[PDB]
Ligand binder design. Sequence first.
Ligand code: ANP
Ligand code: ANP
Ligand code: ANP
Ligand code: ANP
Lengths: 281, 268, 281, 268
Amino acid sequence: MLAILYDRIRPDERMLFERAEALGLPYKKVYVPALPMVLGERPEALEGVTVALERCVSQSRGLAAARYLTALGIPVVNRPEVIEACGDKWATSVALAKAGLPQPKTALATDREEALRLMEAFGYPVVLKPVIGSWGRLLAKVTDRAAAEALLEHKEVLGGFQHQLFYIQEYVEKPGRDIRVFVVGERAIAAIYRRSAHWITNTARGGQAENCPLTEEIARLSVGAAEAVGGGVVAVDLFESERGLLVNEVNHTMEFKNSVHTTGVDIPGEILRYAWEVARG
Amino acid sequence: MLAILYDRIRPDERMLFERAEALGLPYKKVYVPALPMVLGERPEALEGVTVALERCVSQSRGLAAARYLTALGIPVVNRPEVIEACGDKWATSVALAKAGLPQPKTALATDREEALRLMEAFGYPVVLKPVIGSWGRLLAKVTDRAAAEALLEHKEVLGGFQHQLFYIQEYVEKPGRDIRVFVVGERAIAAIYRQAENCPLTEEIARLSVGAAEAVGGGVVAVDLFESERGLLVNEVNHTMEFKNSVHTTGVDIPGEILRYAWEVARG
Amino acid sequence: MLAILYDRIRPDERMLFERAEALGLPYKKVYVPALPMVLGERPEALEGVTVALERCVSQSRGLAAARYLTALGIPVVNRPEVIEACGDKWATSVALAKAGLPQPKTALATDREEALRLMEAFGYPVVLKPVIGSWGRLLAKVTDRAAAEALLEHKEVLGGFQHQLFYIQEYVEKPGRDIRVFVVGERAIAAIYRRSAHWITNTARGGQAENCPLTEEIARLSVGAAEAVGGGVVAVDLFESERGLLVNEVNHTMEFKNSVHTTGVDIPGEILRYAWEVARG
Amino acid sequence: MLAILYDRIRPDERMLFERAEALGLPYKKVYVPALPMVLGERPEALEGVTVALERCVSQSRGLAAARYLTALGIPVVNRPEVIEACGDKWATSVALAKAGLPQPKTALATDREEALRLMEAFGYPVVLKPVIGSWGRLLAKVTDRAAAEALLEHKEVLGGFQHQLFYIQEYVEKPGRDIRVFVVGERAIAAIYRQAENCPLTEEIARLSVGAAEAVGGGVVAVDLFESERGLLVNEVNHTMEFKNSVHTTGVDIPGEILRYAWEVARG
Ligand SMILES: Nc1ncnc2c1ncn2[C@@H]1O[C@H](COP(=O)(O)OP(=O)(O)NP(=O)(O)O)[C@@H](O)[C@H]1O
Ligand SMILES: Nc1ncnc2c1ncn2[C@@H]1O[C@H](COP(=O)(O)OP(=O)(O)NP(=O)(O)O)[C@@H](O)[C@H]1O
Ligand SMILES: Nc1ncnc2c1ncn2[C@@H]1O[C@H](COP(=O)(O)OP(=O)(O)NP(=O)(O)O)[C@@H](O)[C@H]1O
Ligand SMILES: Nc1ncnc2c1ncn2[C@@H]1O[C@H](COP(=O)(O)OP(=O)(O)NP(=O)(O)O)[C@@H](O)[C@H]1O
């Protein structure tokens, strides 16, 4: 049986339930917060479970649960190695550099002094990001030294250990949008332009979205980024820069609720077929 | 040649510096907080470096630097995968379970009510640990429900989301000491009881320690064992071992063995 | 006009709106998160406002807003002095000691070593509380030295500055319940028994409630506690101990949604009449 | 007689100790972290104490001790009400507004979107402060919306609920210095520019400083002023003044004046 692991039901999960039924896939939902995860002891909720789709909103919960399923010998999409690689921006950027994929100039400082040096060397504006976090949390477009000094002080004084690694990236001049590509295994299945006047292009900051036709370069880059972080089912974010397409981020738990209408592609169905027909083995 | 990555020089790093010199091993010390880590730009400090020993006191700095060196095609001891796995007690316990290695009964909950239900099923006393090292601060032996309830709320309310993962373990009755085993590759080279005394290697200690090291991906690690009534149990695997005193205690050339290992790792 | 200041509408606030209409009181609701609080400049939402009832769930928001209203010369129930005194358990206990009101033995430590000494001197079980917090947050019944050491370590390692003051109180053996008294000015208007098997007697931990008839001692103590913290409209919590009634806590923003049915007393109406007829002047 | 409440002895506290001795003033030093503060049990350390000077470096410890001494009927300099009011910049600004004292244009928001709307209406640059002292860490001069957006999110996401109160203030153009005035009761006794130099008292400095001290409830406080194009503006009022260097800079017996004040406060 397919288990859909979750903590909060979003419309994306509701769509997954609907397609599983329409497809005649034997499935059940598993509420991860109530799941006892004792090593050596399969909990009641997972008896009969033959493959799992990890759909938790909390990535630390999602990752702990993915790890647990691997301990029980149940295949999980995505694998913990993929979730871990996607959940740490430095691990992602390192993986992309190794794969030889194009990305914005990217650097890591482990103290305030190095972080300032780098931002000055990159030149303003420059982007500062937390290494761990999601949904565009705590990103900063830093436009001068005093904004830089103040952000770093807030990270040091208020942030935990994680916020003491400073992820510094060239600010990329985008043409009012970015690209998100939905990758299922070795295929790019669909893509969107996310258009906004705000440098953070999400729906919530006054942004809109349209179909992004797959081009040979968009598909090649996206699938390559997906392979770089360990494969599976992922959303790849790209920027159109002056020097060509750059890979920005890879997301382990992709949202698609509006994008199935935008693209006309059966994204939840592709996800479910991948889990049932390839991950399950 | 070798680079030793460090942030604060401890006596352990000086012994490595002094053993390398004594061995006539070409090496440089690389101060990570000042190392420029720009992807696609090899820094001057890493020119001609063929292997690195990750010796940072900060594990998150150490991991970040290890990843960087892998992007440069420089083998690092330990590999980022090993550091990652050792640094998360749930990742370690899962790897141990998958390798079939003995360990205390262990569970994770992601929610206070389930964590409380689990603690209740384990029975008191039960141990609660943070999943991400402290280095050892927040561990509690919890002896009843009221203590359990309060600690779980404190973790949740006060702690980062990191403290929202509740690592629950059976309390193991044992002889008021632990065994720490120094593993270098496929060999246990030395062990201590922790006034720490030498712990002569046995077949059981050697087999289980190397097994635990392999389970987390292999390398240079310290493995902690419990002497339980049901046998030796793996507690934790540490990615950056301290050995300053244990060189005297065990009479084993721990730093020499580490550097010899790093030299073979240099091959690719 | 009466302004009801709020951040999240609970059933208590809904009842307040209903009684204000039934009473023909000119009133409006003011959503504090959207309220611009510029000193020297009355915002649009407060034009015509003649008295305010502070009903925010967040006590730091509620207090900031109460302070603001005083800067505009608008009477507010409760006054900031009352909110501040009720919101800090040490300030409350100090005020009760000065008033000569009976309370559990209570002490404050400002470091781990003093906190341990006190708990050992009080003897287990002993209660440890944060000085600031509400709705029974972070309370601990501490039953031995190792539970004590572990709680103090979590406070020190994970808590901010506030959690570095340790409020230590004798554990009071209660008869399976505590008393809450609703005080409006110089009158105790109603009271409840809060019954539970859990030492924290709230609804959420499996507790129930019944009418607590007002006795001369219950009324005298409750009104006296109310005066001790600066007066106004407050809920006073008492314990029946072996040495008589003790005052535990005074609450600046009382909840009463179930208690109007339990007691048969028009609690929101009394609150509204106090604000309109006495605080407004 | 006098008790001086302290936690860490700074040069300021030694000068107080040494002035009291020189004055022949009977006093004791009371180490607050070891002071038993049990309500209803006067501790031995406070026997015969008729007034206290609150000199703790930690303001939350200092406030807690001040409250305790008031329960004992011992007058404290400063009173808990004054410490409380000085320690919260929104409480201070509100007290200043109510007293009709000049200050920079100041606003509070409790929500990021409203805070951003306010910053936008003030116009850039604008100052963002934490409401609860740092002692001075987190203050930002914010020069545009992007910087504003990021700082507000960092405060909200990373900070305690204390950082969910957004204290917004007009940026004041001023001559690259501030004035700090030492107020003892109804008198300004000395002032500095802050290589801090003496700032001779004037009528304007004296009037506004004593007014600010009275606005927060009166006592022994340092008042910070801005020399703006529209006059002197009150910035902050500090409940535990430091004066070690300023005794030399101003040539005023600051500690003597503080102790004289404490002696009159002893009367009730
Ligand atoms: N270096 C950069 N230059 C320009 N724009 C950037 C840069 N980094 C991020 N952005 C924008 O900021 C947003 C968030 O990116 P990021 O947080 O790195 O990944 P993400 O969380 O997957 N994206 P989102 O869906 O917005 O949360 C995207 O809309 C990007 O276009
Ligand atoms: N499940 C358990 N049962 C009994 N004792 C335990 C258990 N887990 C840990 N301990 C004990 O807890 C103490 C501290 O354990 P731990 O925190 O894992 O090591 P540590 O103190 O971090 N040592 P180090 O790594 O050198 O800092 C040791 O004495 C262990 O014996
Ligand atoms: N010293 C004590 N001895 C026994 N029980 C106590 C003690 N302190 C608190 N309690 C119980 O714990 C609960 C919370 O008290 P406290 O947090 O101090 O005030 P409160 O938040 O107004 N009450 P609540 O409505 O439960 O949130 C009450 O039900 C009390 O009966
Ligand atoms: N609204 C404002 N406009 C211009 N400058 C300001 C404003 N508020 C504060 N400052 C300046 O900010 C700097 C630090 O201010 P502040 O943090 O209030 O004092 P501080 O650094 O804490 N001094 P201390 O109390 O001795 O630690 C000073 O140089 C002030 O001049």
